[PDB]
């Protein structure tokens, strides 16, 4: 077990807003 | 980078690192490990460096 607590809701909301996809389908890799 | 045409320096102060032990007698390309590592990087955080 370890001590851990949820972050403030406001911070979590804004953080989750800005999360771009790591891998995307690009038809070009040349 | 995978082709021998580019060299990249990533400036990290400190970071969590993990490592894998392989057999010297087995040929392999380690690109998939890095690609997996890249697949989980986002503006919020990063996984440990392999």
């Amino acid at each position: 077990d370890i001590i851990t607590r949820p972050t403030s809701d406001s911070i979590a909301a804004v953080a989750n807003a800005t999360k771009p996809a790591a891998v995307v389908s690009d038809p070009q890799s040349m | 980078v995978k082709a021998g045409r580019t060299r990249v320096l990533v400036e990290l102060g400190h970071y969590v690192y993990t490592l894998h032990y392989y057999d010297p007698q087995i040929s392999l390309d380690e690109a998939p490990i890095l690609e997996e590592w890249l697949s989980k990087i986002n503006p919020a955080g990063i996984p440990p460096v392999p």
Partner: protein, 50 residues
């Protein structure tokens, strides 16, 4: 079509001889619609790299 247009012009036209009055009334509605108090909200910081 606030005034001088009810049963005088077609549904697809606008009265060119009463333009000033209609514009004035439209602006008045625009003004009255914004009479508010800009209330504060919950400010917070972002742990994101951006």
């Amino acid at each position: 079509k606030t005034v001088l247009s009810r049963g005088y012009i077609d549904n697809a036209q606008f009265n060119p001889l009463a333009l000033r009055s209609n514009v004035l009334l439209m602006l008045l509605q625009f003004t009255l619609s914004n009479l508010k108090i800009n209330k504060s909200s919950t400010f917070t910081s972002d742990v994101t790299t951006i």
